[PDB]
Amino acid sequence: GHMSRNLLAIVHPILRNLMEESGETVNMAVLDQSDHEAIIIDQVQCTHLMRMSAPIGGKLPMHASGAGKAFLAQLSEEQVTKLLHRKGLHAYTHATLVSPVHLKEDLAQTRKRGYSFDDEEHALGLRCLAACIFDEHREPFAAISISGPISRITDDRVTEFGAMVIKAAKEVTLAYGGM
Numbered sequence: 001g002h003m004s005r006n007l008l009a010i011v012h013p014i015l016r017n018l019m020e021e022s023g024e025t026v027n028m029a030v031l032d033q034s035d036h037e038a039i040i041i042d043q044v045q046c047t048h049l050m051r052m053s054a055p056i057g058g059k060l061p062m063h064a065s066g067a068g069k070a071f072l073a074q075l076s077e078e079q080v081t082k083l084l085h086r087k088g089l090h091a092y093t094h095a096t097l098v099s100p101v102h103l104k105e106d107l108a109q110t111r112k113r114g115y116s117f118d119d120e121e122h123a124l125g126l127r128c129l130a131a132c133i134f135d136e137h138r139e140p141f142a143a144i145s146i147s148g149p150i151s152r153i154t155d156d157r158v159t160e161f162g163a164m165v166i167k168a169a170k171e172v173t174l175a176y177g178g179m
Helices: 005-022 066-072 077-088 100-113 155-176
Strands: 025-032 037-044 126-134 140-149
Touching (some): 005 025, 005 037, 005 140, 005 155, 037 066, 066 100, 066 126, 066 140, 140 155
Protein backbone atom coordinates (compact mmCIF):
# COMPACT_ATOMS: atom_id res chain seq x y z
CA GLY A 1 0.00 0.00 0.00
CA HIS A 2 1.18 3.54 -0.73
CA MET A 3 0.59 6.83 1.07
CA SER A 4 -1.38 9.22 -1.11
CA ARG A 5 -1.64 12.85 -0.06
CA ASN A 6 -5.38 12.38 -0.35
CA LEU A 7 -5.41 9.56 2.21
CA LEU A 8 -3.33 11.74 4.59
CA ALA A 9 -5.97 14.41 4.56
CA ILE A 10 -8.58 11.79 5.39
CA VAL A 11 -6.54 10.36 8.28
CA HIS A 12 -5.17 13.61 9.62
CA PRO A 13 -8.16 13.77 12.04
CA ILE A 14 -6.84 10.58 13.70
CA LEU A 15 -3.37 12.08 14.33
CA ARG A 16 -4.86 15.28 15.77
CA ASN A 17 -7.05 13.26 18.10
CA LEU A 18 -4.20 11.09 19.39
CA MET A 19 -2.21 14.25 20.03
CA GLU A 20 -4.85 15.76 22.30
CA GLU A 21 -5.36 12.46 24.08
CA SER A 22 -1.75 11.55 24.73
CA GLY A 23 -0.61 15.16 25.06
CA GLU A 24 2.45 14.41 22.93
CA THR A 25 3.68 14.86 19.44
CA VAL A 26 2.21 12.39 16.95
CA ASN A 27 3.92 11.24 13.75
CA MET A 28 2.93 9.21 10.65
CA ALA A 29 5.82 7.49 8.90
CA VAL A 30 5.85 5.51 5.73
CA LEU A 31 7.81 2.35 5.08
CA ASP A 32 10.21 2.55 2.17
CA GLN A 33 10.25 -1.11 1.15
CA SER A 34 13.05 -0.55 -1.39
CA ASP A 35 15.60 1.11 0.87
CA HIS A 36 14.22 -0.14 4.27
CA GLU A 37 13.72 3.32 5.83
CA ALA A 38 11.07 4.85 8.05
CA ILE A 39 10.18 8.26 6.63
CA ILE A 40 8.11 10.77 8.50
CA ILE A 41 5.42 12.10 6.22
CA ASP A 42 3.04 13.68 8.68
CA GLN A 43 2.95 15.13 12.19
CA VAL A 44 0.73 16.88 14.75
CA GLN A 45 2.81 18.56 17.47
CA CYS A 46 1.68 18.95 21.03
CA THR A 47 1.77 22.40 22.69
CA HIS A 48 4.37 21.76 25.38
CA LEU A 49 7.47 23.99 25.21
CA MET A 50 9.66 20.95 25.47
CA ARG A 51 8.64 18.30 22.96
CA MET A 52 9.67 16.15 20.10
CA SER A 53 9.71 17.88 16.72
CA ALA A 54 11.06 16.08 13.71
CA PRO A 55 11.15 17.62 10.22
CA ILE A 56 8.68 16.31 7.62
CA GLY A 57 10.61 14.00 5.39
CA GLY A 58 12.87 13.07 8.29
CA LYS A 59 14.26 9.55 8.47
CA LEU A 60 14.19 7.33 11.55
CA PRO A 61 16.64 4.53 12.42
CA MET A 62 15.05 1.09 11.86
CA HIS A 63 16.62 -0.47 14.98
CA ALA A 64 16.45 2.38 17.48
CA SER A 65 13.05 4.07 16.92
CA GLY A 66 9.35 3.61 17.48
CA ALA A 67 8.38 3.39 13.83
CA GLY A 68 11.69 1.79 12.92
CA LYS A 69 11.28 -1.09 15.34
CA ALA A 70 7.53 -1.38 14.79
CA PHE A 71 8.47 -2.14 11.17
CA LEU A 72 11.59 -4.20 11.88
CA ALA A 73 9.29 -6.35 13.99
CA GLN A 74 7.62 -7.73 10.89
CA LEU A 75 10.59 -9.06 9.04
CA SER A 76 12.21 -12.48 9.48
CA GLU A 77 15.44 -12.89 11.37
CA GLU A 78 17.04 -13.42 7.97
CA GLN A 79 15.67 -10.11 6.69
CA VAL A 80 16.71 -8.45 9.89
CA THR A 81 20.24 -10.00 9.61
CA LYS A 82 20.37 -8.47 6.14
CA LEU A 83 19.68 -4.98 7.44
CA LEU A 84 22.24 -5.61 10.16
CA HIS A 85 24.88 -5.06 7.49
CA ARG A 86 22.52 -3.61 4.88
CA LYS A 87 21.67 -0.60 7.07
CA GLY A 88 23.65 -0.62 10.33
CA LEU A 89 22.93 -1.00 14.05
CA HIS A 90 24.46 2.36 14.94
CA ALA A 91 24.70 3.22 18.64
CA TYR A 92 22.64 6.35 19.31
CA THR A 93 22.67 5.93 23.11
CA HIS A 94 23.78 3.50 25.81
CA ALA A 95 20.27 2.04 25.65
CA THR A 96 20.27 1.48 21.90
CA LEU A 97 19.86 -2.22 21.14
CA VAL A 98 23.26 -2.47 19.37
CA SER A 99 23.46 -6.25 19.86
CA PRO A 100 21.23 -8.36 17.51
CA VAL A 101 20.60 -10.83 20.34
CA HIS A 102 18.90 -8.23 22.51
CA LEU A 103 17.40 -6.42 19.47
CA LYS A 104 15.83 -9.46 17.90
CA GLU A 105 14.70 -10.25 21.48
CA ASP A 106 12.99 -6.85 21.84
CA LEU A 107 11.62 -7.20 18.30
CA ALA A 108 10.02 -10.42 19.46
CA GLN A 109 8.46 -8.75 22.55
CA THR A 110 7.16 -6.05 20.19
CA ARG A 111 5.04 -8.45 18.13
CA LYS A 112 3.84 -10.17 21.29
CA ARG A 113 2.94 -6.82 22.90
CA GLY A 114 1.52 -5.24 19.79
CA TYR A 115 3.33 -1.94 19.92
CA SER A 116 7.03 -1.05 19.67
CA PHE A 117 8.74 0.85 22.39
CA ASP A 118 11.87 2.97 22.09
CA ASP A 119 13.04 3.82 25.60
CA GLU A 120 15.73 6.44 25.18
CA GLU A 121 17.26 4.31 22.38
CA HIS A 122 17.05 6.97 19.63
CA ALA A 123 17.90 9.92 21.89
CA LEU A 124 18.48 10.59 25.58
CA GLY A 125 15.24 11.46 27.35
CA LEU A 126 13.05 10.53 24.42
CA ARG A 127 10.38 7.91 24.48
CA CYS A 128 8.37 6.67 21.55
CA LEU A 129 5.54 4.16 20.93
CA ALA A 130 4.49 3.09 17.41
CA ALA A 131 2.14 0.55 15.76
CA CYS A 132 1.99 -0.38 12.07
CA ILE A 133 -0.73 0.53 9.55
CA PHE A 134 -2.03 -2.17 7.22
CA ASP A 135 -2.99 -2.26 3.56
CA GLU A 136 -5.05 -4.93 1.78
CA HIS A 137 -2.48 -7.77 1.53
CA ARG A 138 -2.14 -7.39 5.33
CA GLU A 139 1.21 -5.75 4.55
CA PRO A 140 2.43 -2.96 6.85
CA PHE A 141 3.10 0.17 4.78
CA ALA A 142 2.70 2.90 7.41
CA ALA A 143 3.32 3.43 11.18
CA ILE A 144 1.72 5.89 13.63
CA SER A 145 3.71 7.00 16.68
CA ILE A 146 3.66 9.13 19.84
CA SER A 147 6.99 10.53 21.00
CA GLY A 148 7.78 12.59 24.01
CA PRO A 149 10.14 13.30 26.92
CA ILE A 150 10.36 10.75 29.67
CA SER A 151 9.42 13.46 32.16
CA ARG A 152 5.90 13.14 30.78
CA ILE A 153 5.79 9.69 29.14
CA THR A 154 6.21 8.08 32.57
CA ASP A 155 6.75 4.37 33.13
CA ASP A 156 3.16 3.96 34.36
CA ARG A 157 1.65 5.55 31.21
CA VAL A 158 3.55 3.39 28.76
CA THR A 159 0.87 0.72 28.52
CA GLU A 160 -1.84 3.41 28.37
CA PHE A 161 0.25 5.01 25.61
CA GLY A 162 0.75 1.75 23.79
CA ALA A 163 -3.01 1.20 23.79
CA MET A 164 -3.79 4.64 22.40
CA VAL A 165 -1.47 4.05 19.42
CA ILE A 166 -3.15 0.69 18.71
CA LYS A 167 -6.60 2.26 18.71
CA ALA A 168 -5.29 4.99 16.37
CA ALA A 169 -3.44 2.70 14.01
CA LYS A 170 -6.41 0.33 13.79
CA GLU A 171 -8.57 3.39 13.02
CA VAL A 172 -6.25 4.26 10.13
CA THR A 173 -5.87 0.76 8.75
CA LEU A 174 -9.65 0.42 8.48
CA ALA A 175 -10.57 3.97 7.54
CA TYR A 176 -7.87 3.50 4.87
CA GLY A 177 -9.38 0.52 3.12
CA GLY A 178 -12.42 1.52 1.12
CA MET A 179 -12.65 5.29 0.90
